């Protein structure tokens, strides 16, 4: 078996799925109704972008907490069961914290495979981003 040279092929297989961008339902604190938006990662998966009614962007550097909203008990065997998403972040200027929710659209062409795959993928990375460092060198170790 080979350890590796750079990155984790496993985590890399998702990098493509994340960037691709999946459709979800974004709900703003003010808006009570879900709106169809697009969630994708940046070139260096170091920032999140949004496209829709307006130009929105959620910097991962600001994001504090990031968890996935699970309906409940798993329908089948063991998998990345995920129907929704929960992310927390603060904006410079306002007062308090802003959270963003992402759900799977109930349209004919949504791509449950890609969508559900994106959610899990995001969290997965969001874990290494904190649990560990991105670049090995500048660390204070």
From Swiss-Prot:
One of its GO terms (cellular component) is endosome. Interacts with PTK2/FAK1. This is Zinc finger FYVE domain-containing protein 21. Plays a role in cell adhesion, and thereby in cell motility which requires repeated formation and disassembly of focal adhesions. Regulates microtubule-induced PTK2/FAK1 dephosphorylation, an event important for focal adhesion disassembly, as well as integrin beta-1/ITGB1 cell surface expression. The keyword Repeat does not apply. The FYVE-type zinc finger mediates interaction with PTK2/FAK1, and also interaction with PI(3)P and association with endosomes. It is found in: Cell junction, Focal adhesion; Cytoplasmic vesicle; Endosome. The gene is ZFYVE21. Residues 8-135 are annotated as: PH-like. Keywords: Cell junction, Cytoplasmic vesicle, Endosome, Metal-binding, Zinc, Zinc-finger. GO terms for molecular function: zinc ion binding. It comes from the Eukaryota. It comes from Homo sapiens (Human).
